[PDB]
Amino acid sequence: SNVHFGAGCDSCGVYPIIGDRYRCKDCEIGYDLCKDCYETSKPGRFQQHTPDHRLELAR
Ligand SMILES: [Zn+2]
Ligand SMILES: [Zn+2]
Structure with a gap:
């Protein structure tokens, strides 16, 4: 799974963003x-x- 340590979703609050x-x-x-x-x-x-x-995909 792609886990974006450090990043949370500023719409729904999911932290870390997965995917x-x-x-x-x-x-x-x-x-x-x-x-x-x-x-x-x-x-x-x-x-x-x-x-x-x-916004663009974080790579
Ligand atoms: Zn979200
Ligand atoms: Zn902006």
């Missing part, structure tokens, strides 16, 4: 989503992270 992790390119603090949240975010927006922000 795919999407990491915000624009976000300083940092902003991460799990696969389930990324394939539906949320209140998932606030702060520094706007819907204008793009």
